[PDB]
Amino acid sequence: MQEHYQPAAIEPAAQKKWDDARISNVSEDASKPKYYCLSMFPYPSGKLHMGHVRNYTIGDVLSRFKLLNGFNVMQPMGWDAFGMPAENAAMKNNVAPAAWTYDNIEYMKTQLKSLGFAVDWEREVATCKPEYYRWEQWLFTKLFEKGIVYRKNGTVNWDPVDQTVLANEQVIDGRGWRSGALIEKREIPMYYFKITDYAEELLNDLDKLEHWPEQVKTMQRNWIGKSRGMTVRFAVSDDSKQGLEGDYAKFLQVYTTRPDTLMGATYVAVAAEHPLATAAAADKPELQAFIAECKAGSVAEADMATMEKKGVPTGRYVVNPLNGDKLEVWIANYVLWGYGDGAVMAVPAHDERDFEFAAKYNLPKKQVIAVGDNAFDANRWQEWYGDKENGVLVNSGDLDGLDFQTAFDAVAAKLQSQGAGEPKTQYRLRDWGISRQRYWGCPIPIVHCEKCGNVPVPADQLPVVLPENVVPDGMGSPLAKMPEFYETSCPCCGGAAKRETDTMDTFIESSWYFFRYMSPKFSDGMVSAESAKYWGAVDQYIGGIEHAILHLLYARFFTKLMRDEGLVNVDEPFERLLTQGMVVCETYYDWINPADVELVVISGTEKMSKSKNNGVDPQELINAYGADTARLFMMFAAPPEQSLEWSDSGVEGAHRFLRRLWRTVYEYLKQGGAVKAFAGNQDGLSKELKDLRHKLHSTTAKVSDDYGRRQQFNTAIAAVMELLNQYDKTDTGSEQGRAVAQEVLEAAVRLLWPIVPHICETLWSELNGAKLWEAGWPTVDEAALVKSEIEVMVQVNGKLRGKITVAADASKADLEAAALANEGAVKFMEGKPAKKIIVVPGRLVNIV
Ligand SMILES: Nc1ncnc2c1ncn2[C@@H]1O[C@H](COP(=O)(O)OP(=O)(O)OP(=O)(O)O)[C@@H](O)[C@H]1O
Ligand SMILES: Nc1ncnc2c1ncn2[C@@H]1O[C@H](COP(=O)(O)OP(=O)(O)OP(=O)(O)O)[C@@H](O)[C@H]1O
Numbered sequence: 001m002q003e004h005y006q007p008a009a010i011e012p013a014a015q016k017k018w019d020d021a022r023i024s025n026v027s028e029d030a031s032k033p034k035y036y037c038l039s040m041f042p043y044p045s046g047k048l049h050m051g052h053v054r055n056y057t058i059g060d061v062l063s064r065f066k067l068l069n070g071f072n073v074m075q076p077m078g079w080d081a082f083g084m085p086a087e088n089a090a091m092k093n094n095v096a097p098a099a100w101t102y103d104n105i106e107y108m109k110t111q112l113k114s115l116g117f118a119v120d121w122e123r124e125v126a127t128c129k130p131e132y133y134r135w136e137q138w139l140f141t142k143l144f145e146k147g148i149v150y151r152k153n154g155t156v157n158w159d160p161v162d163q164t165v166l167a168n169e170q171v172i173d174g175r176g177w178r179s180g181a182l183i184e185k186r187e188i189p190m191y192y193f194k195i196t197d198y199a200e201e202l203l204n205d206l207d208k209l210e211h212w213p214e215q216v217k218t219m220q221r222n223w224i225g226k227s228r229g230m231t232v233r234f235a236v237s238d239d240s241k242q243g244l245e246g247d248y249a250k251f252l253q254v255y256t257t258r259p260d261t262l263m264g265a266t267y268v269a270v271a272a273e274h275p276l277a278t279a280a281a282a283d284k285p286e287l288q289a290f291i292a293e294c295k296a297g298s299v300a301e302a303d304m305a306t307m308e309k310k311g312v313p314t315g316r317y318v319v320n321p322l323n324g325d326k327l328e329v330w331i332a333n334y335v336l337w338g339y340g341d342g343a344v345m346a347v348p349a350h351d352e353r354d355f356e357f358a359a360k361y362n363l364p365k366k367q368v369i370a371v372g373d374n375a376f377d378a379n380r381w382q383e384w385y386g387d388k389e390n391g392v393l394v395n396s397g398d399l400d401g402l403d404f405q406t407a408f409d410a411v412a413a414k415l416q417s418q419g420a421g422e423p424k425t426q427y428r429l430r431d432w433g434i435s436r437q438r439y440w441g442c443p444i445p446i447v448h449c450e451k452c453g454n455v456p457v458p459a460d461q462l463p464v465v466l467p468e469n470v471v472p473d474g475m476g477s478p479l480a481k482m483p484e485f486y487e488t489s490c491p492c493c494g495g496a497a498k499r500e501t502d503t504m505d506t507f508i509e510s511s512w513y514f515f516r517y518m519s520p521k522f523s524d525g526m527v528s529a530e531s532a533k534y535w536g537a538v539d540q541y542i543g544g545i546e547h548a549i550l551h552l553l554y555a556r557f558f559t560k561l562m563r564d565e566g567l568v569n570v571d572e573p574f575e576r577l578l579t580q581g582m583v584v585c586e587t588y589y590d591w592i593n594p595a596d597v598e599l600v601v602i603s604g605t606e607k608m609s610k611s612k613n614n615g616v617d618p619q620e621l622i623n624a625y626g627a628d629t630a631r632l633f634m635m636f637a638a639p640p641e642q643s644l645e646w647s648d649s650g651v652e653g654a655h656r657f658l659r660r661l662w663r664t665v666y667e668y669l670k671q672g673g674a675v676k677a678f679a680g681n682q683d684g685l686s687k688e689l690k691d692l693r694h695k696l697h698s699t700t701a702k703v704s705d706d707y708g709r710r711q712q713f714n715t716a717i718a719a720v721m722e723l724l725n726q727y728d729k730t731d732t733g734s735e736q737g738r739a740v741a742q743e744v745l746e747a748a749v750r751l752l753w754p755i756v757p758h759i760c761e762t763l764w765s766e767l768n769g770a771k772l773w774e775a776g777w778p779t780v781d782e783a784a785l786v787k788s789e790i791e792v793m794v795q796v797n798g799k800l801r802g803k804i805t806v807a808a809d810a811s812k813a814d815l816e817a818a819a820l821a822n823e824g825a826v827k828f829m830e831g832k833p834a835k836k837i838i839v840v841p842g843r844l845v846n847i848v
């Protein structure tokens, strides 16, 4: 063993040893319990940064822990390769997105290999290969014929100068980002997943996820946005039907989640696109001006809550079906056409939005709910006005005295009897729009034939291959300008036809990649039945909380779709979620990387990302310090969920601890070479050695619980540091001394192998000839945790009457119980009671 830690030498050697042993290349091996640990796969940026290092070290720590415990661990890696960044790089450098992607992939892969992750590279996938995306094309065609995927007109942001559809992210203040021209809203045919059909399942199955963070479930529930409410019809008055056609002539239908307050309705509001708004504005130019100002606004909720709520009265009137009141209709900019009925009732006494609306326009407020003796101020909004759990109805006829749920059900039966309403469930969830007017994505397997309609490509003809010899320009999809791509024959009649030129939402690739990892060379289906049966679901998923919504929702949706097609047999893809805090670092700029700088403006610490260029290249850190220093620093600097600050001092600390670990083992074996680790009965060991073994086996139980239950790796490292501290203060020079030292060192390097496997692998080989992964995770010797018994003097009225042997963990009540039963106290207390029993732990007990 060389004297000095040399990571540049030992880290490649260790990586080659694990590779030749194929410990990370796994099969569906029934002889071993499976563990599937997945980290969210990366987009091929070109270069990884410390955030990716942190995410993937965390996944590798968990994988290696389960490995050492005997599990058949699958930890796969791959590339989320489709999307816009490659298209922007293509426009900049005049290269094909495919070429730019594969070059970024090869570089990032070597970056990952040099960090020493225990990754099954034989299961590697790149989502832009036809071998991958043919299967989401396949599932598209299968769902299309079931109607679960359908084609429908939807609205998009059209830029009339760049001649391209824009996302909302690139429409700033109503104009194009790179053009500034005023955007048109156009309706074009597009494809959708009918995800609303699965809303109840996506909501209820969250209860099955007993090991998910509660907030992630809460975010999923809020996004789906289920509500149980009431459809309520208000009859149109006799005088207010002019211009109304159809059902809109007879009643105004609204949706409310507070039907218990229907007696308190004072006005009603419709969306600017509602038929009643259109009829009233026929001769009112102010209503036309208002309608037009609403239609020229974002229904985006990011602007809806921060929007000033405005309305104008229509002069039209409807009748409340419960109390008979005639209420005026208002047009309001907050009523969204498309959600529910596009019309609402307003109860300003018990809904905050309605309260502010009615205050501005002096519209009436009628109290119908009371919470105790709380006083109702028509001019001041109190938070209990909207209390739904502790309230009771008021001014509501025969509904007086009921609580929310009882009133809800009474209104339900009342309205159904009068035919003016019924219970209804709504969801904020909309269907999932699939179509993108972009080149670098999965082609949509549809053919358009003027005879047969829009026809899916037969499975025998899949994939529809995306041509890779293409350099996008920024002025529209190249696919729609490539007749050699879109000109085809119809698969149903054989006539001349046109391929769909839109591509798929790149969320689709990451919605099932975790199943493809189970059998990524399988060419007869998305995933083989045998491999899906063996691997089941993902045991552990590690990735940022920013994806806790759409990505997770889509992945759970696809899981259920694939289950329904009989491809997998689980309801949920991810059993546990770990979402790691972001790594942050200072900024400089005109955005500059901090590596390029020496101690440009020096702005404020902020998350590492490509947008402000503050991403620190791990390759610089590995060249300077080694992979193990990188991994240790990230695992030690903070709990995984907490944010991590880049610190060169933190790197220096990690490296010097690795030297301390090296120095310890080398010094130990300089002083006499390897011996058999201490094992077995420890009676007869010196107090100092018994205490080091107590520290050792306490450290083992603590590290095991921090890896396996708490997932807090910083404290696990601190515990092993305390073990080494006690080791350093223990004389291990004797023959039993050396045996315990060997046992300590053999445990320490196994305990840290998940964090820093390169140094631990090399150190282990110098301590012990067995294979580290066969010796397995260190076990707890519980005999080593029993401290020694004490002798306690039993006194009666002060005079010593007996002695007792109690444990070193015995409470003051064990001492008191043991003292009263000692045969010396019994025959000197004279059957009298104890007026007081003074207990001094470890010394004596005295009964008074
Ligand atoms: N098209 C619409 N545009 C705007 N508001 C609407 C629309 N349809 C219904 N509403 C109003 O939204 C209210 C609540 O609907 P929503 O789906 O937001 O439930 P919620 O936020 O869970 O309810 P709550 O306010 O009790 O917490 C209904 O009472 C109704 O007054
Ligand atoms: N600064 C950071 N600190 C910690 N983890 C990070 C950081 N930046 C990214 N990650 C994590 O690294 C993983 C890769 O994220 P990234 O945004 O690069 O790609 P992605 O998940 O494929 O999505 P997209 O296609 O939008 O880029 C995620 O789990 C993310 O949470």
Ligand SMILES: [Mg+2]
Pocket (backbone or CB within 6 Å): 208, 210
């Ligand atoms: Mg369960």
Ligand SMILES: [Zn+2]
Pocket (backbone or CB within 6 Å): 449, 450, 451, 452, 453, 490, 491, 492, 493, 494, 495
């Ligand atoms: Zn045809």
